[PDB]
C-alpha cells in the first residue's frame, strides 16, 4: 500500500553501517555501479497468512 516513491524515500533515510572511507565517490553517470563505489541490499518480503 505504501507508495513506491515514498518507499524509496524511506529506504534512503535508513543509515548504513558501512565504513565510508573504504569506498569512493561514484563518477558522473555510471548507473551500473562498480565494486569500489557501490553496495547492494536485497529486500524480499512476502506476507502470508499464518
Amino acid at each position: 500500500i505504501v507508495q513506491d516513491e515514498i518507499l524509496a524515500h524511506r529506504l534512503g533515510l535508513i543509515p548504513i553501517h558501512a565504513d565510508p572511507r573504504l569506498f569512493e565517490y561514484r563518477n558522473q553517470g555510471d548507473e551500473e555501479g562498480t565494486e569500489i563505489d557501490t553496495l547492494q541490499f536485497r529486500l524480499q518480503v512476502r506476507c502470508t497468512r499464518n
Binding site: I1, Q40, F41, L43, Q44, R46, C47, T48
Partner: protein, 50 residues
C-alpha cells in the same frame, strides 16, 4: 519500513553510493552535532537566607 498484508509482496534492490550531507540530508552521519558556550554564573554580592 512498511506494514504488509497477506498477498502483498515487497521485492527490491538498493544501490548505495558515497555522498556528503550537503547534497542530501540522508548522508548526514551526526543526528545532532552542536556546541554551546560554557556558562559561568557569578554572584555580585553574597546571597544567603531563604
Amino acid at each position: 519500513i512498511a506494514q504488509l498484508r497477506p498477498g502483498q509482496e515487497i521485492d527490491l534492490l538498493m544501490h548505495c553510493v558515497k555522498g556528503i550531507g550537503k547534497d542530501h540530508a540522508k548522508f548526514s552521519p551526526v543526528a545532532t552535532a552542536s556546541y554551546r558556550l560554557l556558562p559561568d554564573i557569578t554572584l555580585l554580592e553574597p546571597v544567603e537566607g531563604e
